[PDB]
Amino acid sequence: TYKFFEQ
Amino acid sequence: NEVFLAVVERLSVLIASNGSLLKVDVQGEIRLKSFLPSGSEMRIGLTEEFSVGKSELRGYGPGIRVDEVSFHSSVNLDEFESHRILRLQPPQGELTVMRYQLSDDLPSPLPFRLFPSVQWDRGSGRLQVYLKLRCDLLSKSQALNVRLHLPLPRGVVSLSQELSSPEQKAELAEGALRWDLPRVQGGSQLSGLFQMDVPLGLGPASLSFELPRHTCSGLQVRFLRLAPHKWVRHLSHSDAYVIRI
């Protein structure tokens, strides 16, 4: 449901 | 000891020669810097109201809003929907915690409007360029390092310039006027009259500036708490605020 990033 | 958090928004705009906004883009980030003890947990509270995206059901209105958001993989979002709280165990040093983007209107007026007056003797080759810059921030608030860059027709020379106040600087360089206005507050109107000789492509003007204690989106960090001394900043900046003339 949410977007994530690693940096 | 110490925790620093900054909400930093990069603003880009394109404004038409009649003053009408064509494009607005805000890229925002929340950045954290900390050096806390083992297993330390931090909670960040954002603006309570704010919505994300464009609801097909509810539509979108005035209010604080962003078009999209993303989060660092270590952030836990259990309390985000009901309370706009973010939770995480930070590393030592710097992290970007959240990114977001906004492409639709701002909840507040654009910080700068330009009113150009151009007369071009086709002629004796004489070009007169009058620029009035109005800051539409609140009177309390400041814009720092404001520079206006204005491309000029090929081979133009400066005959003269009159600036509205002694602290402004201006020069022709690299085929363009560079006008520096280091003192700018909400409600300021600063102006420059430039007499040049052209032996169209005039413009567009491109402004660059920083806006301390401000976000273009209206978003704010409301609280920062452990579950140390704290510095919280909100800054907007632009190197691409384009105004056609």
Numbering used by the authors:
A (entry chain B): 686 to 692
B (entry chain A): 185 to 383, 400 to 427, 436 to 453
From the publication, what sentences describe this entry?
Adaptor protein complex 4 (AP-4) is part of a five-member family of heterotetrameric adaptor protein (AP) complexes, AP-1 to AP-5, known for their ability to recognize sorting signals in the cytosolic domain of transmembrane proteins destined to post-Golgi compartments. A stronger and more functional interaction is one recently found between μ4 and a YXXØ-type, YX[FYL][FL]E motif contained in the cytosolic tail of the Alzheimer's disease amyloid precursor protein (APP). Unexpectedly, the binding site for the YX[FYL][FL]E signal of APP is located on subdomain A of the C-terminal domain of μ4, but at the opposite face of the predicted YXXØ binding site.
Surprisingly, the single mutation D190A abrogated the interaction of μ4 with the YKFFE signal. In contrast to what we expected, the single mutation D190A did not preclude the interaction of the μ4 C-terminal domain with the ENPTYKFFEQ peptide, instead the ITC analysis showed a single site on μ4-D190A with Kd = 40.6±2.6 µM. The area of the interface between the YKFFE signal and μ4-D190A is 431.1 Å2, analogous to that on wild type μ4 that is 430.5 Å2, as calculated by the PISA server. The μ4-D190A - YKFFE interface maintained considerable polarity, and all eight direct hydrogen bonds between μ4 and the peptide are preserved. Of all the stabilizing interactions, Y687 forms with its phenolic hydroxyl one of the shortest hydrogen bonds with the carboxylate of E265 on μ4-D190A. Additionally, Q692, the last residue in the peptide, forms a bidentate salt bridge with its free carboxylate and the guanidinium group of R283. Together, this crystallographic analysis demonstrated that μ4-D190A binds the YKFFE signal, and provided evidence against the possibility that even a minor change in conformation was the cause of the weaker interaction.
